[PDB]
C-alpha cells in the first residue's frame, strides 16, 4: 500500500540545524507568549528565558500572564559546557503546530545564564522530552509530556523526523527554512521509507539503548560490545555530534583514517576543531566509510542495524574566509559519559519514542541527504547472542 501521512497538522513544525538544534514554535501563559523552543530528548526539564539576555530576542514575562504560577523554588543548573539558574512555577502551554490542546505545565523561568543561549540559534528555551528521573531539581517535578498525556488523549508516543540540508544555513535561511517534524502523539508515513525496526529503552531515565556491534564499511570495530555503551547509550537530539566512549572512539577513528586514507586530513579535522573544504561539488563522499550501529532487537537473539552516510556525519559549515567551496566538519567525537546519537544521526533517521511501549523505532529519513550512489538503511533481522551482556552496570 501508498503510505499515508495522517498528521499533516504537525508535518513541518521544526526549524533549525544539527549545530544549533531544532525548535518547535510553543506558547506559554494567558494571553499566549510565543517562543520558539528546543526539542531536547537528552533532558527533562521545560526552561525558557524569563529575563533580558542579549542572544534572546523575546523571553517569558510571567508578570503578563493571568494563569502563572510561582512554585516558590529556585533551580541551578550547572553542565559541562555551560550553566543557569531560575524559579519554578507552572502556566498554560500549547504548541501551535501541534495537538489542538492546550496542559498546565512545569516551566522554569530562566533568570541568569552563562554560554547557553547560542548567538544566532532562534530558541529562546528548550523542551526537555525525557523522563522524570534526571529532571531538575528532581523527580518530582513532573517534565512536560508526562502532564501532556496525564492531562489529555494524546498517546504516550512521539516521533521526529530532523532534516539536515547538507549545506550551511546563516540564521536569516534557517528563519525561512522547514527543518524537519515533530509528530506528537503518532506516526506519520509520509515522513520514511522502508520498514520500521524497534529497539528496547532499556530504563526510562535518559531514552537509552544498547548497541551491540559497530563496522566502518561492513568492517565489525570488533570490540567488547559492553565498550560501546560504557557507561550508557542514549538517543539525544540537543546534542550535535555522534559522541562515543573514549576508546571505541580511538578505535573508529583509525578505521575511518584507513578507509579514507587515499587523502590525508590534519589532526585538527579529526579532533572535530577545524573545518575541511572542497572545491564546489567536488566533496569526495565515495572515499569516506559508511557507519553501521547494530541496536538490540525486540525479538529474543534478534538485532538490526542503521547505517549511516558521510552526508550524516561530516556537518556543512560556512568558509571562515569567502569561497563557494563546499565545507564541513567532521561531527564524531569522544565522550566519557558514554554514546550520545546526536543530530547528524538522527538526521538519518524517523525516529518513534514509543514510550508507551518502552521501545525506540528507526527507519530511513525521506529527508536524508545522500548520494546517487549510496543511501541510509535499516535493515534486519540478525542473528545475534547475549546481548544483554552489552549493558553496563
Ligand atoms: C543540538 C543542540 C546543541 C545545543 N544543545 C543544548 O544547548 C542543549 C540544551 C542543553 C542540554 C540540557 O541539559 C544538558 C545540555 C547539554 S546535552 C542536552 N541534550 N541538553
Known amino acids: 500500500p501508498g503510505r499515508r501521512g495522517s498528521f499533516v497538522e ?13 525548535y518547535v514554535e510553543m506558547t506559554v501563559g ?3 507568549q510565543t517562543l520558539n523552543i528546543l526539542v531536547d530528548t537528552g533532558s527533562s526539564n521545560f526552561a525558557v528565558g524569563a529575563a533580558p539576555h542579549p542572544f534572546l530576542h523575546r523571553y517569558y514575562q510571567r508578570q503578563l500572564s493571568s494563569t502563572y504560577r510561582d512554585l516558590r523554588k529556585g533551580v ?12 519554578l512555577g507552572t502556566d498554560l502551554v500549547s504548541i501551535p503546530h501541534g495537538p489542538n490542546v492546550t496542559v498546565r505545565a512545569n516551566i522554569a523561568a530562566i533568570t541568569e545564564s552563562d554560554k547557553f543561549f547560542i548567538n544566532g540559534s532562534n530558541w529562546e528555551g528548550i523542551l526537555g522530552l525525557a523522563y522524570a528521573e534526571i529532571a531538575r531539581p528532581d523527580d518530582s517535578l513532573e517534565p512536560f509530556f508526562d502532564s501532556l498525556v496525564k492531562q489529555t488523549h494524546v498517546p504516550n508516543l512521539f516521533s521526529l523526523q530532523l532534516c539536515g540540508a547538507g549545506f550551511p544555513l546563516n540564521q536569516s535561511e534557517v528563519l525561512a527554512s522547514v527543518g524537519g517534524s515533530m509528530i506528537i502523539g503518532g506516526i506519520d508515513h509520509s515522513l520514511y521509507t522502508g520498514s ?8 526510562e531515565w535518559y531514552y537509552e539503548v544498547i548497541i551491540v556491534r559497530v563496522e566502518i564499511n561492513g568492517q565489525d570495530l570488533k570490540m567488547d560490545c559492553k565498550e560501546y555503551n560504557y557507561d550508557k547509550s542514549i538517543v539525544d537530539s540537543g546534542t550535535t555530534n555522534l559522541r562515543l566512549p573514549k576508546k571505541v572512539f580511538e578505535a573508529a577513528v583509525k578505521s575511518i ?5 587515499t587523502e590525508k586530513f590534519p589532526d585538527g579535522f579529526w579532533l572535530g ?3 575541511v573544504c572542497w572545491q564546489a561539488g567536488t566533496t569526495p563522499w565515495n572515499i569516506f566509510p559508511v557507519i553501521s550501529l547494530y541496536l538490540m532487537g525486540e525479538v529474543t537473539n534478534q538485532s538490526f542495524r542503521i547505517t549511516i552516510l558521510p552526508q550524516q556525519y561530516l ?15 567532521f561531527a564524531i567525537s569522544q565522550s566519557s559519559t558514554g554514546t550520545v546519537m546526536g543530530a547528524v544521526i538522527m538526521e538519518g533517521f524517523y525516529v518513534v519514542f514509543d514510550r508507551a511501549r518502552k521501545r525506540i523505532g528507526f527507519a530511513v529519513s525521506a529527508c536524508h541527504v545522500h548520494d546517487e550512489f549510496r543511501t541510509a538503511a535499516v535493515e534486519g533481522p540478525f542473528v545475534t547472542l547475549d546481548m544483554e551482556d552489552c549493558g553496563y552496570n
Open 273 to 275: 576543531e577545524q573545518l
Open 315 to 329: 556537518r556543512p559549515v560556512e568558509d571562515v574566509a569567502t569561497s563557494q567551496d563546499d565545507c564541513y566538519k
Open 196 to 203: 520500521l525496526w524497534y529497539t528496547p529503552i532499556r530504563r
Open 76 to 87: 541551578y543548573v550547572p553542565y559541562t559546557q555551560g550553566k543557569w539558574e531560575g524559579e
Open 10 to 22: 504537525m508535518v513541518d513544525n521544526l526549524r533549525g540545524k544539527s549545530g544549533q538544534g531544532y
Open 30 to 32: 494567558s494571553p499566549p
Open 257 to 261: 583514517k584507513a578507509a579514507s586514507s
